[PDB]
Design a protein around this ligand. Structure first.
Ligand SMILES: Cc1cc2nc3c(=O)[nH]c(=O)nc-3n(C[C@H](O)[C@H](O)[C@H](O)COP(=O)(O)OP(=O)(O)OC[C@H]3O[C@@H](n4cnc5c(N)ncnc54)[C@H](O)[C@@H]3O)c2cc1C
Ligand SMILES: Cc1cc2nc3c(=O)[nH]c(=O)nc-3n(C[C@H](O)[C@H](O)[C@H](O)COP(=O)(O)OP(=O)(O)OC[C@H]3O[C@@H](n4cnc5c(N)ncnc54)[C@H](O)[C@@H]3O)c2cc1C
Lengths: 300, 392
């Protein structure tokens, strides 16, 4: 009945929103709480350090919080959840702001990172996101999260989102105040020269486990600081994570551990790591390719 | 309280869904009946004679039944209506069918007309459109009573308070009676049969989607030549006419004229065909000339075959009115029934100003209200104008 999320980004909002509709439809769903160091949609803003905010989303903005508003496998009230959910869509956003015609008339431009933010923030308003402003300091098991506002929050499930800190590698974060490695790569390479089947799986990965591990890894390869989050775990809880995983915390190990609901599910408590559910469950889960199956996974 | 619509296509659905929304949502609206001679969305099917049904819609399909879900002016339960209305969108249609991931993933391909008919049809199922299957034959004041003839041979008279005309004419109607002048429908029939005379000096009149589709069919036949005859801020005026009145008649007239050319896809297939040439000017005169047909623009051209893909004859509807109602409109409109005169009469609710009963003529509304009303560019504003506007 209570699910904590590190970061208030697309995934956080994706999970929250789906929870908002489920319970509001007579169905059960976790109460959803995001802890967020900076702001809803923070990593899409200039002050987030990962981008200037000016470069454009590199996937179609329709691929949003509820996309693709469909399940190959789900149970119960599918028609009505989808419908409810489209209320929080990109198109729904444009139409509340009365700019939907402008969008269409301009040729559907891909939005700036900073407007994608406005979107996220808007979804937060729309579902009255239960939001804790603060920085997750440490995590431990049932989970208890130390948030520096310094205080603790107990929750039953836990989701980690974000690619980490734009400051920790210059660092990309430093790079936007003023030999380059790695989309993010795509952008900053940009501002330096001056100074159907594969795609289906990203949005629909329910045929994922019917092609070789060699094949999947290839889809993940060519797709283009992943373990940053380990730091948040005390030794005690990282230990407990080393166990379920069945060895030291690399990602041959972490990735393969990750179950159908995006949770490891070798522990006494659920830890959701969608950013590492590419190889196991579907290559879109790490990003914006299918936020709606992601939400579907952790709540249904 | 009751609104009769000639034809069940985008505009009928635009208005009837907005009706259905509003009635279910407390607010008042008329029961909306649509009389349709063929099928819901029939003019987007091959069987409607206007298209082979396989060509693609040239406007973004997001410009649908409720677009753009926003009024500068209309107030009332707006969020609840836009939210209700988006249920009937292209997007929703794709989502209810599971195909939305594929649509996005394929690059948002524009739908084939016949898929756009499936959309229209789906919306009809979804709003439980009150549909009457027959041809409107006669319209007449006294509200309106309209004669509808079923295929069963029966003929009944529906009555209504208000009436909207939709549709662009008849596909079987060339602009000139001559067997070498072909209505668009005869074209599809003959194209389909490969019975278009080999090595003809063919002409296609028209400059829009109807002409675009047919040029694209006709390049597939062994024609000798194929001559084509036609005469952001802008774009925005199609979706949002609110600032249309802040423009002169030569300004407003020159947006409506650019409204005519062709698809980027079709453009290529024509750009890269040595037989296809473009001819400028206006068809002042068509007359048979023995073996061929002679078309005047002056300049005279002869052709072994002419295809009328103008996309409609806009006063076609007048042929439905009886003398009484025609005169009655001639009086309201202030002179004889020319295009110009009838356009000049269109009010803000899209109806003829100063007429005893309500006659909604969206297709005539470009000049006076906005250039999107005739087409798929602002169906949601249209529905508003005919249902939610109050004074004048
Ligand atoms: C510039 C950029 C562009 C991208 N473009 C796309 C794209 O176009 N399409 C696509 O599919 N994917 C793309 N990606 C991949 C992308 O990272 C994921 O799609 C995206 O991160 C999903 O957001 P999220 O919810 O996982 O985390 P984010 O939205 O990045 O949110 C993480 C949040 O956590 C907060 N935070 C950080 N540390 C802490 C802490 N210790 N405690 C509490 N809060 C914290 C931050 O302020 C931030 O708000 C892009 C990535 C970047 C960096
Ligand atoms: C092939 C084609 C392509 C077009 N492409 C576009 C486009 O891509 N984008 C755009 O904005 N606009 C385009 N247009 C302009 C187009 O006509 C309008 O945009 C669109 O027609 C809206 O249709 P409607 O509701 O007015 O009527 P329609 O969709 O034509 O339907 C009218 C209905 O009337 C029925 N009918 C005819 N006579 C009678 C009668 N006596 N009684 C009862 N029913 C009758 C027909 O069966 C038909 O179903 C196109 C037009 C054509 C012909």
């Amino acid at each position: 009945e209570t699910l904590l999320v590190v970061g208030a980004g697309p995934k956080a909002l994706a999970v929250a929103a789906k929870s908002h509709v489920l319970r509001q439809l007579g169905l059960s769903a976790p109460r959803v709480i995001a802890v967020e160091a900076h702001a809803v949609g923070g990593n899409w803003l200039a002050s987030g350090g990962w981008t200037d905010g000016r470069h454009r989303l590199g996937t179609s903005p329709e691929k949003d919080i509820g996309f693709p508003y469909h399940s190959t496998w789900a149970r119960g009230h599918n028609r009505e959840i989808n419908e409810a959910m489209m209320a929080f869509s990109w198109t729904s956003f444009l139409v509340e702001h009365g700019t939907y015609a402008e969008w269409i008339d301009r040729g559907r431009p891909s939005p700036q990172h900073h407007v994608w933010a406005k979107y996220l923030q808007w979804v937060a308003r729309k579902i009255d996101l239960e939001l804790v402003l603060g920085k997750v300091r440490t995590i431990r098991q049932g989970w208890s999260v130390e948030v520096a506002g310094t205080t603790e929050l107990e929750a039953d499930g836990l989701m980690i989102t974000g690619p980490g800190q734009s400051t920790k590698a210059l660092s990309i974060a430093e790079f936007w105040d003023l030999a380059v490695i790695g989309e993010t790569a795509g952008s900053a390479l940009d501002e330096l020269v001056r100074h159907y089947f594969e795609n289906s799986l990203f949005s629909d990965p329910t045929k994922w486990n019917a092609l070789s591990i060699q094949e999947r890894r290839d889809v993940i390869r060519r797709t283009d600081q992943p373990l940053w989050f380990l730091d948040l775990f005390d030794s005690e809880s990282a230990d407990l994570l080393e166990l379920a995983v069945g060895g030291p915390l690399t990602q041959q190990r972490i990735e393969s551990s990750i179950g159908y609901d995006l949770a490891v599910t070798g522990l006494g408590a659920k830890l959701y790591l969608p950013n590492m559910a590419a190889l196991a469950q579907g290559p879109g889960f790490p990003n914006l390719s299918c936020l709606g199956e992601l939400s579907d996974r952790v709540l249904r």
